[PDB]
Amino acid sequence: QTERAVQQVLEWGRSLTGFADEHAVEAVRGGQYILQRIHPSLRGTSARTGRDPQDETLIVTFYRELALLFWLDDCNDLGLISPEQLAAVEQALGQGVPCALPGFEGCAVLRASLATLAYDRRDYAQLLDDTRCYSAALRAGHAQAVAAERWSYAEYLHNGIDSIAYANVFCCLSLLWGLDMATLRARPAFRQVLRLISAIGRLQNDLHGCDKDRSAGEADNAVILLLQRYPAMPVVEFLNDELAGHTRMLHRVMAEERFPAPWGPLIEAMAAIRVQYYR
Amino acid sequence: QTERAVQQVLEWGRSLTGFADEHAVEAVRGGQYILQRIHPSLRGTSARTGRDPQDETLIVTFYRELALLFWLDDCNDLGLISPEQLAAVEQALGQGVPCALPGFEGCAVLRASLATLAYDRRDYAQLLDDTRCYSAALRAGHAQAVAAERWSYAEYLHNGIDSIAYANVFCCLSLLWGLDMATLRARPAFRQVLRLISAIGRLQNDLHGCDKDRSAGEADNAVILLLQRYPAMPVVEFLNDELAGHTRMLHRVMAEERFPAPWGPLIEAMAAIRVQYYRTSTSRYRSD
């Protein structure tokens, strides 16, 4: 249930400097959206895993990991905290250890729960890996926005695929419900869909907030970056065609490959989730 | 001898309908360039693998795979053989079996040599999959050029990464010289640099042939695709920036990963190869 899930995310969230209520709220709303979409398929893996679709401890840990990702993003930008504080947080979340600086106890606590709940501990090691990748991409994008020289579209998109965090969302679901992502990752086509869906998410997100960012003066957005470098280029039309192109590619792969449940529906729910559905 | 290697690629090429002298000559020119650039490293790995950089059997098979790639590209673009023949050739090469139609016995000879010579057989299967991706990309780019809808820059580049065939080249080198590409592929960063170097080869080639194409009525090229879909866009400026961005990314990952020899030098040699160094030269003289 929504309001309750939210309260539980909010109470854990109190042990993190810079945590806002919308962190919990966006987390629950986006996490709800995904779970509802994969529920029918998830119920099919239960019998094998012993992990129930509606298990309250699993669901709330998932929402807390989502809020952590939203919070971390804000830390890097709204500047809720310092590069030192952020570096300590990064080490805690990326290695699974107590944070060496005060004010971020919720970090060791969430990671500890994830470690204990992991169906396949490999997924926990993977999640730490994905966490370091995601925070490094937040830091790189943030620094690039005020750097002496501008990134190419290729660099932005590549970084944007890591900072959209879909890899993290998938890892966390596999960890909790035993989705065997480690095995799927051995498949090139699975890796390609992971990048495709992340790029779709990065592009939908940027196209959605470009007007706001344009007025506000925000350069960590594909539309602004391209408009700054290529004033004459029809940037929005281009990015929209890019989004359409990645979506077509994802469709060809999906139609050609068959991924064990619930990956097919998980992939499609992420492909469809817009940023306006939870922000 | 350079000429003896050309003749051994040619003799084998005689068992491939549509094979031209130019396919052999450009293969040896491009293949020699690559082998020269990584020669000191291969001397280094030869102690552990038992595969000599000077072994003529390995060199000639490598050049024959390159000639195959040049021939296949021409078959797709100049209609050297029929659509029915190309499909049979592609099936034979993608599964590593004899061609079902006659006139292509070289497909069987080459695939069987690769199978026999493979240091790590996982590279042989990889080479078959790369061959399949390669021929499919060549066809897809040809088809999209008269298709109803133009694809996005993103589709073009994904296809273009398969059509430049760097993956095939690397795999063939690992196959013959025991370079462990199948093991290194377990590293995400290794797979990332493979995609970067291919994209770099594709952007470099396209920024070079856009005036050749535009002239001949060829829309299968990034500069042409983008100018057609976005006439006001500074396409050449954008693509050069993309190329420089992919290069900066490649340099950063290579510097972090410290891949084992000869991979750094191999990636660098491909970054530097100019079509100028192998294609351009050969073309059978005609009195005019």
Q: Which residue in B241, B251, B253 has the most chain A C-beta atoms within 10 A of its own C-beta, making it the best mutation to test that interface?
A: B241
CB atoms near residue B44 (< 10 Å): 13
Are A242 and B153 within 8 A, CB to CB?
A: yes
Chain B, window 208-237: residues with a beta carbon less than 8 angstroms from a chain A beta carbon: 229-230, 232-234, 237
**For residues B209 and B275, what is the distance between their CA atoms, to the nearest angstrom?**
10
Task: Identify the closest residue of chain B to A246 by CA–CA distance.
Answer: B154
Distance, CA of A151 to CA of B243 (rounded, Å): 12
| Tokens coding A265 | 């529906």
- What is the rounded distance in angstroms from the CA atom of residue B84 to the CA atom of residue B70? 19
Q: Which two tokens stand for residue B15?
A: 């068992």
Domain ranges of chain B: 1-288
Nearest Cα to B52, choosing from B238, B209, B174, B177? B177
Contact (Cβ atoms closer than 8 angstroms) between residue B186 and residue B126: no
- The length of chain B in residues reads 288
Residues in chain A: 279
Residue reference for tokens 């000077």: B54
Chain B residue numbers touching A229 (CB-CB < 8 A) = 241
Amino acid at A39: H
CA distance B206 to B244: 14
The residues near A60 (Cβ < 8 Å, ≥ 6 apart) are A5, A8, A9
Measured between alpha carbons, how far is A90 from B288 in angstroms, rounded to an integer? 69
Judge whether B207 and B240 are in contact, CB under 8 Å.
Answer: yes
- Rounded Cα distance between B243 and B249, Å, is 10
Residue pair A117/A58 in contact (Cβ under 8 Å)? The answer is: yes
The answer for residues whose C-beta is within 8 angstroms of residue B171's C-beta and 6 or more apart is B123, B126, B127, B130, B181
What is the number of other CB atoms lying within 10 angstroms of the CB of residue B236? Answer: 14
Chain A residues lying within 8 Å of B234, measured CB to CB: 230, 232-233
Neighbours of A76 (CB within 10 A): 22
Does the distance separating the beta carbons of B249 and A230 come in below 8 Å? no
Looking at chain B, after which residues does the C atom sit over 2.5 Å from the next written N, breaking the chain? none
Sole residue written with tokens 């991706």: B133
Nearest CA among A77, A63, A75 for reference residue A12: A63
B38 contact partners, CB below 8 Å, separation of at least 6? B262, B265, B266, B269
**Resolution for this model in angstroms, one decimal place?**
2.0
Kindly report whether the peptide bond that precedes residue A262 is cis, defined as omega within 30 degrees of 0.
yes
Residue A152 to chain B, least CA–CA distance (Å)? 5
What type of residue sits at position B46?
A: S
| Rg of chain A on CA atoms, in Å | 18
- Chains A and B form CB pairs within 8 A to the count of 62
User: Are B241 and A155 within 8 A, CB to CB?
Assistant: no
How far apart are the C-alpha atoms of A170 and A38, rounded to whole Å? 12
Read off φ and ψ for residue A20, nearest 5 degrees: -110, 160
CB contact under 8 A, A154 and B191: no
Residue carrying the six token digits 């590279």: B123
DSSP alpha helix (H) spans, chain A: 2-13, 21-49, 56-76, 83-95, 105-117, 121-145, 153-163, 166-177, 181-184, 188-216, 222-229, 235-256, 263-272
Angle formed at CA B252 by CA B249 and CA B254, multiple of 5 degrees: 105
Pair B16, B107: CB distance under 8 Å: yes
Within an 8 Å CB–CB cutoff, is residue A40 touching chain B? no
**CB pair distance less than 8 Å for A242 and B152:** yes
HEC letters along chain B: CHHHHHHHHHHHHCCCCCCCHHHHHHHHHHHHHHHHHHHHHHHHHHHHHCCCCCCHHHHHHHHHHHHHHHHHHHHHHHCCCCHHHHHHHHHHHHHCCCCCCCCCHHHHHHHHHHHHHCCCHHHHHHHHHHHHHHHHHHHHHHHHCCCCCCCCHHHHHHHHHHHCCHHHHHHHHHHHHCCCHHHHCCCHHHHHHHHHHHHHHHHHHHHHHHHHHHHHCCCCCHHHHHHHHCCCCCHHHHHHHHHHHHHHHHHHHHHHHCCCCCHHHHHHHHHHCCHHHCCCCCCCCCCC
Q: CB–CB of B132/A188 below 8 Å?
A: no
Give the separation between CA A108 and CA A236, rounded to whole angstroms.
42
Q: Which structure tokens are listed for B265?
A: 């030098």
Distance (Å) from the alpha carbon of A139 to chain B's nearest alpha carbon: 16
